[model samples]
Target: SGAIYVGNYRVVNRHLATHNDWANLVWEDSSRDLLVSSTTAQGCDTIARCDCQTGVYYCSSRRKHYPVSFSKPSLIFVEASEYYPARYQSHLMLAVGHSEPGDCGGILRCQHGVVGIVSTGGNGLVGFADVRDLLWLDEE
Candidate 1:
């Protein structure tokens, strides 16, 4: 079996979301520092669609608001892998921003394309945050 590692540390509690689409992630540092990241695409429209055969637009957009948050001393894991799903093959997203709550809510936004990182929580943490290109660490 192959192993995935972020920087030099191995990933733990690898939570995989299938067909869940892009979800925003937010977290607080040990010093009460808050952070954010996007797990999928920007607009929920990317995942929503209309079926022509049935002539119905039954799909709705995903959550653009309400980002998942974490606290400091949290070990964030990141990895880039080639996704081979027939629909979204080799997909990825860009780390958008880390804003304060109420103003954008620290959610990472991405362009309509594939080029982002896969995040996992380490050290008993749950949920994933973008952390944008740079992994933010808790101040010691």
Candidate 2:
């Protein structure tokens, strides 16, 4: 086969996560500041399904409604709580940035503050979560 593999990964510690009710398990090495976590639980803050039939997106959690111009390619508008009447502060945001193929879970250092952790990426853009989301998830 002439197809060359761009990356490789191994599966480890599955049951440990399932039993302990771990949200997402990531492999982070502090020594080198490298993270090996894949894009697991960091997709959309709220799951507003693309309701193409009625042109209204409905999220199951709170029954929030949003109208979407259903088309082949569309920009999903995720809003913050203070601004939008339907939702809370969304941690995930999209941005066009320089990134490698397997750069998920990597630190997104915006000069001074570590703003985000890179989640998913491809083509001209990448997804990241506001570091504060992780802070919120952190227990006392």
Candidate 3:
């Protein structure tokens, strides 16, 4: 079964991406792009296990920030994880390095803030939605 043996949670009021929706996103990747969510049936629940888990780590991974080798002001809706369950405008990914597919649907945290929501991942690449409406177009 090609089923994505992920978590089982109830989500509501999800949002889908559309044309001209993500063009406003700034193309940037950093160690701060921490991916978090319940991928697999038994998802992670302890913060201590992360930094030591096999193939599962963040927060203190690369421990730096910067633009990516192919940084661009664009987003990608993973071919397998285009739509997910969420109560906000979370639908694509900036493809930050690598992670797991079930890891999709997680939250992309940046410096103690929910910058974006995750979607798909594979081959050293993870996808997530970057709602730049607040980060861009409008500023404080």
lDDT of each: 0.23, 0.31, 0.32
| Tens digit of per-residue lDDT, candidate 2, span 1-140 | 00101112111112112322233434432211223333323322221222121133222222343332222222233332221333322334455544333444443332233344444344545444334223322221
Model 2 quality (TM-score): 0.32
Q: Which lDDT tens digits does candidate 3 get at residues 65-128?
A: 3232222224333343334432222334354465554443344444323334444456766554
Report the Cα RMSD per candidate.
18.4, 17.4, 13.8
Q: Which is the better candidate, 1 or 2, if ranked by TM-score?
A: 2
Worst ten in a row by lDDT for model 2: 1-10
* Top-scoring candidate (lDDT): 3
In the range 34-74, model 1's lDDT, one tens digit per residue, is 22333332222221121111111100122223232233223
TM-score of 1: 0.18
Give TM per candidate. Answer: 0.18, 0.32, 0.34
Point to the candidate with the largest TM-score. Answer: 3
Clashing pairs in 2: none
